[PDB]
Structure 1
Amino acid sequence: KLFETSPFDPLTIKNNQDVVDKLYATQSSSIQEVVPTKTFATELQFGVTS
């Protein structure tokens, strides 16, 4: 068996965004070179709205 848990089931994906969302969901099964945590933001701007 190539994978104990498949990265994504291809029949359930409809477009590119579907692949990335599934890859983020099944990333715990993989050996991550970086383990995610809270993100740090160094830039933020708010634009005027209608």
Structure 2
Amino acid sequence: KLFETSPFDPLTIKNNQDVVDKLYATQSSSIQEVVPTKTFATELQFGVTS
């Protein structure tokens, strides 16, 4: 078997956004360079609304 669990099922995904979301769901099953945790932000702005 190429993979213990497939990265995603191609028939299920419909657009590029679906591919990205599926990769984020199954990313724990792979050997990851950086194990995800809570993220850190250094810049943030809020524009005026209507």
Q: Tell me the TM-score range normalised by the shorter chain.
A: over 0.9
Structure 1: gaps of 5 or more residues: none
The alignment covers a number of residue pairs equal to 50
Residue in structure 1 matched with residue 7 of structure 2 by the alignment? 7
TM-score, length basis structure 1: 0.99
Identity of aligned residues (%): 100
Q: Deviations over 1:20-49 (max 9, x none)?
A: 000000000000010000000000000000
After superposing on structure 2, the runs of 4+ consecutive aligned residues of structure 1 that deviate more than 4 Å are none
Higher helix share: 1
Gaps of 5+ in 2: none
**TM-score, normalised relative to structure 2:** 0.99
